[model samples]
Target: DVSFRLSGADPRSYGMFIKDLRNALPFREKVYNIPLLLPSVSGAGRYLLMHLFNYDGKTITVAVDVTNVYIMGYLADTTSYFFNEPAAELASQYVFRDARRKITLPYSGNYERLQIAAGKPREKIPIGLPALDSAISTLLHYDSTAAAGALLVLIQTTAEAARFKYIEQQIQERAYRDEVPSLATISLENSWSGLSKQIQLAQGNNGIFRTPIVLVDNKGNRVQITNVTSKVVTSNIQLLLNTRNI
Candidate 1:
């Protein structure tokens, strides 16, 4: 029973869309009335498949129960929706006073500081993860679409959801254990197409005959090394050089 609020300047537009969507919905199995979140409507030719991915280009998997897959659209700006609640009370709540037995209710004497210094400006509507928006926008720019904006959602299977959960757990554990190297020490590039060659470069020494030889994984994926740090690969190299001077 996930709920979302879709608001816009023109409420009537949403109203019509919601109406069309509802009429288009298949009528067969159950008598369940999917609550209207928007005004306008639909059924036939209303469905569209969606694919979702993360910032690391990893796919996001989700499982939905057919029984619980209820969608309703609405159009009212502030008040009406799938359900209803009082506007003032919903916006603000009454706090109980410990000294006085009664609760502190809304009043006409409420003070509004006219010259209050504003902190940072609030983020724009439809706020989301910065990297995620950027990545998706990159893909969208390549395709054909002149829409002002869009919304995306991912749906997947139960097993995939579990796998994703497992991955998240692993990532969190790595973070807590400090096993993952810092971004400062690592330079990652999206060389997906050229990774095999990159691996070869990493395997071959920079023509410097060295003690530490490069090794590839069993999958033959390239292991990249950045020369950002001044640290020597062999700790005893400095000592060996100093001994030579002696």
Candidate 2:
């Protein structure tokens, strides 16, 4: 019931890492060979994250690379990855043909919802994520000190799109419409880049990363704020701009 493929990077990089993503499942502690691999990546190690779903309405955010499979889920500390091999293995067994059974933006459940805001802003910066690669390169090379970083949001579903509409309006109403038109809106089907982009804007803990709004600062500082209408995002936004507080 658990068959999957490798995308992103290359083969030698993966070098049988898929089996590790599988083999490491049984062990929560560190396993040296357990680094999620892309076999042989062409360049900077990066890969698409797996969007494994659960029937209980839990979401697993997986960020992969030539080396590691970073993950965030309910009932585990973001400090340590909470793997859902059992759930993912089971989900992989069936066909997600139904409506709500389809993939969705990062969402948090009831008890673990608020934990989304918990994390050090500067640490765990996943440079392996390719979406923010250009932005990072720009800050490091281009303007050097350019202000106003990029904010990526996905609008793949009607509910997601509608929510973004309100979120977009709120951004304009509260902040400068023209000044901060800096949002990377991504919409797509379940392709390699698509699945990877989903994780490119990833958060490691608190599975309820509702409508991931990833912020990248000029220095390439990365932080994810889920819920669009949240005040928590304000600080992350403030950090992204770096120059002034929003």
Candidate 3:
């Protein structure tokens, strides 16, 4: 038989503390130390925050996720570029993969059944994702402000390409046919202004000052966030956070 001493506010809190003490009582097992003493309860409504003093004092919102493990998940998988290629080649990879995925984009479940826009596929790649392997990893690998500055630069360059492509296609089409160009005829005629608008939208209001959580493709270009229903944290962490499962 094993004997263990336990102390805490309740079983609801400090589970590992009690488990370790009790599990070690009958065995010759040595005890493992807790990393930090759990803070005193500040009542139900108070916010919990954890600031990592080691990693340049990165502050994470502990109020939203109480479990330290949960916070660690976002930190560990918080988006990064892929591929071991040189920076110059990474952007081309982003373009090819993004376009391929869009071209082969499929519908799932209920989304597949409808006509009109339901099963309708995209006619073409809307925009080429900027290939800036150097620019992107700088944003991810380094929390440095310069890396984010590079991202903004890439965004602007890509926007220009979109603007030029849109204009050139319209001009070429009009010469061969009777109809006016599609994007050019859009009354507003914003041109690169449209691209600028989108670039602004993608990066958010914090602009170049904030370190963005970015995902890079297998080639190292930044990848867009997939619109998915559920995202992963830890394997078991999902069970705790899943209200539906409960």
> How well is each residue in 69-184 modelled by candidate 3, as lDDT tens digits?
11111011243222122321222232223221211112111111212222232111121112222333333343423422333323222222222333223323332222322332
**Cα lDDT of model 1 by residue, 92-119, tens digit:** 2221111122111222111111011111
The residue-by-residue lDDT of candidate 2 on 1-246, one tens digit each, is 122222332332222333333433222222111111232333222333343222222333333321222222211112112223433222222222222332222322111221232231212222112322232233222221120121121111111122233223322232211222222322211111322222223334333342464544333445554542344332111101011111
TM per candidate comes to: 0.18, 0.17, 0.18
| Residue 244 C-alpha lDDT in model 2 | 14
Judging by TM-score, tell me the better candidate of 2 and 3. Answer: 3
Runs in model 1 deviating more than 4 A are 1-9, 32-140, 143-150, 153-246
- Arrange candidates, best TM-score first: 3, 1, 2
Ten contiguous residues minimizing lDDT sum, candidate 1: 235-244
Backbone clashes, each candidate:
24, 13, 2
How many angstroms is residue 111 displaced in model 3 relative to the true structure, after the best TM-score fit?
37
